[PDB]
Amino acid sequence: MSVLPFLRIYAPLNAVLAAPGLLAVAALTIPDMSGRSRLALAALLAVIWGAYLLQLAATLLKRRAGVVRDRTPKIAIDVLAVLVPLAAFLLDGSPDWSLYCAVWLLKPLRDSTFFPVLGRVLANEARNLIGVTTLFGVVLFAVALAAYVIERDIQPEKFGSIPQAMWWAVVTLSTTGYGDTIPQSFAGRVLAGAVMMSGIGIFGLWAGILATGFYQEVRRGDFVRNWQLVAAVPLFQKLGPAVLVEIVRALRARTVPAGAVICRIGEPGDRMFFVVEGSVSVATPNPVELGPGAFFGEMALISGEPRSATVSAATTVSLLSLHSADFQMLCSSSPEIAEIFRKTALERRGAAASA
């Protein structure tokens, strides 16, 4: 709610082209298709092949910044991103070689930050997941077995065994309801009453396990990144030790591209920013372009008013941001700083129009 995400967060053309790349698959996969456009997109594989292949050797020129680097992840696919189609091209002379369009699917995941964040936590909590997944397997066959007890007699053809029943378990437990083969008797129909009751508590926990400390990591992700951009601010010599842990949970950083709008004038004042690197376009008769290491919005927050300036991203600014309460929290937290921000609430009145 308090952040300006811009500059094409889904930027890298490596990440982009699997999507157009892999829809190229389908038309090959289909009868009654002319050959015209059939192979026309086979090029587009060759394009994406050649395109990543173009990118490829530039990467293999890894004498760049070659001091200490851990790039087994980033490289893992780039190798295979061209080889797997290639060996596929020949031995699988038949068109099915395109079935090695399973391959680029990691390329989005190549430069997918927030995926390490995902896999980071599973290697702390899977202890639970196992004891639950076991427990999932407990309750599965514990309950799956209860059906073969019954309808083997009059429904062999659907329930003539155990695993045919295990099928109808998790379909029944995991919230799904396919609807292919269903009981006819009473007591077997009774048993479902605990099933959804169970599974929705099972996943009531188990999916909750994920979001539980995932969010801890994500809410932690906004600190590990943001104990940086702290010392850069020239004011933070005075802040006490414990004060920051309160703060950085709320302070998110993002980056705006050049030209874009930051705060348009006259819009309702609802937040303030801490610039740390880049520069701005504070639209005044004399533009007060504050570069790395500044802020604005206090003129509107202390007064509770619209914007005092059409600030626009003159350059690519690594931004921060902040809503009132957390700034009121700061204003509440210390008279030492409200003094200068009060002065600033008068200086920037006289500094906005002036130089």
Q: How far is the CB of 283 from a second copy (least distance, A)?
A: 15
Residue 303 or 332: which CB sits closer to a second copy? 332
Residue 56 contact partner, candidates K ion, a second copy, none, CB within 5 to 8 A by sort of partner: none
Helix (H, G, I), strand (E, B) or coil at 137: helix
Q: How far is the CB of 179 from K ion (least distance, A)?
A: 3
Angle at the Cα of 62 from the Cα atoms of 56 and 66, rounded to 5 degrees? 160
Residue 214 or 274: which CB sits closer to a second copy? 214
Sequence-ordered list of residues with C-beta below 8 angstroms from that of 253, at least 6 positions apart, any chain: 225, 226, 229, 318, 319, 320, 321
CA 276 to chain centre: 24
- The 8-class DSSP code of residue 65 comes to T
CA 78 to chain centre: 22
- Give me the count of residues in the chain: 355
DSSP per-residue codes, 231-249: TTSTTTTS--TTHHHHHHT
Q: Which of 13, 60, 245, 346: binder of a second copy (CB under 8 A)? A: 245
Tell me the β-bridge partners of 272.
322
Residue 271 contact partner, candidates K ion, a second copy, none, CB within 5 to 8 A by sort of partner: none
CA distances from 253 to 216, 250, 261 (A): 18, 10, 16
By rule CB under 8 A, what count of residues binds a second copy? 104
Q: Which of 46, 75, 170, 232: binder of a second copy (CB under 8 A)? A: 170
Stretch that binds a second copy, among 34-42, 54-62, 73-81, 134-142 (CB under 8 A): 134-142
Residue 90 or 157: which CB sits closer to a second copy? 157
Residue 198 or 315: which CB sits closer to a second copy? 198
Tell me the β-bridge partners of 277.
318
Residue 108 or 287: which CB sits closer to a second copy? 108
Residues 258-297 that bind a second copy (CB under 8 A): 266-268, 270
| Contact call for residue 200 and a second copy (CB under 8 A) | yes
The residue to which tokens 């599965």 are assigned: 140
Q: How far is the CB of 258 from a second copy (least distance, A)?
A: 19
Residues 71-130 that bind a second copy (CB under 8 A): 99, 102, 105, 108-109, 112-115, 118, 120-121, 123-124, 126-128, 130
Q: How many CB atoms lie under 10 A from the CB of residue 49?
A: 19
Which amino acid would we find at residue 348?
Answer: R
The residue to which tokens 């950085």 are assigned: 248
Stretch that binds a second copy, among 46-54, 172-180, 280-288, 308-316 (CB under 8 A): 172-180
Residue, CB closest to K ion: 179
Q: Which amino acids are annotated as binding site, given as ranges?
A: 297-298, 307-308, 348
Cite the annotated binding site for 3',5'-cyclic AMP by residue number.
297-298, 307-308, 348
